[PDB]
Assembly symmetry: C2
Homo-oligomer: 187 residues x 2
């Protein structure tokens, strides 16, 4: 309903579930089955209040890898222009994808420390249903520091479970508090 544009990047290694998460955040369902793809989340800013306003929040899923040549990272940097928020997606199974988030973030800070950064960040970990009943505690501590070094909210979910995206959820409140913060900081 608003012609105000909001742009949120979705960064992460290939295979962590960026496509399944974006599909979950927009179409409110599960991904059944190249380049940069964009889906739109219709977010009601301050829903139910006297300041309610409908925004169209673009989720930009850029591909690639953090090991490519700087003549390919410089071409990938034109998509990082005019960013209002960044979602960093990592695989709770693949601990190497959580370290590469530190390189994705610097990739955006190199062609746009973390304490001078003003862009709201959100760290989302995937494949939580694949965690063990005794390794749950060990990996959660490794990601709590991940959300502290970025000064970001943390959310851990399974993209194949539709109860991660049910209304009222604690994953839906941290999500709406993030999209609200993205709109507040100069939408």
């Amino acid at each position: 309903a608003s012609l105000d544009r909001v742009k949120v990047l979705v960064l992460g290694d290939s295979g962590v579930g960026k496509s399944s998460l974006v599909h979950l955040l927009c179409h409110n369902q599960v991904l059944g089955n190249v380049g940069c793809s964009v889906d739109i989340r219709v977010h009601d800013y301050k829903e139910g209040t006297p300041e309610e306003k409908t925004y169209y929040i673009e989720l930009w899923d850029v591909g690639g890898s953090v090991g490519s040549a700087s003549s390919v990272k410089s071409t990938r940097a034109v998509f990082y222009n005019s960013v209002n928020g960044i979602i960093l997606v990592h695989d709770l199974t693949n601990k190497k994808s959580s370290q590469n988030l530190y390189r994705w973030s610097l990739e955006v800070l190199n062609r746009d420390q973390f304490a001078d950064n003003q862009i709201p960040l959100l760290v989302i970990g995937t494949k939580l249903d694949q965690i063990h009943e005794t390794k749950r505690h060990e990996v959660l501590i490794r990601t709590a520091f991940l959300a502290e070094d970025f000064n970001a909210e943390e959310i851990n979910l399974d993209c194949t479970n539709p109860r991660s995206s049910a209304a009222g959820s604690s994953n839906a409140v941290k999500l709406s508090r993030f999209f609200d913060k993205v709109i507040e900081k100069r939408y």
Copy 2:
């Protein structure tokens, strides 16, 4: 270099060469679709002048069909918000893909009708693909049928082959009309 954003839709039936054209407009080469895809064209506004300004022109390749139910056109209408220009792509081989441009354009302008396109201010560009696949017999006949296509829309026309890198090489008659459009898209918006 400028954080000013430009948004151009590229609409057309599936298989007409939207992906091959966008790749040609950005990477200046030849391409050897689910949902909406975006590539970025680095356009130098007023190139060679003291007012030169670098814009990042987003080319939004929206998918789908104009025969789908209005419950799919309502989901596809969120991608049509805040558009600064529209490229309408048709296949010179498939005459049916040029008729569907009449419904692609209206899908964006509403959210057959000569006055709508005469009152339209969003710059339009009609690009016909697969021109190298026409023989030297009906080639002249089909070019006449598309001149009316670009007139009913009050749009510029370009006809090319996306697989030949000389169709969009610099200095071309297709490369100046292209910059005249990206300039017009920036002018009728920011200026």
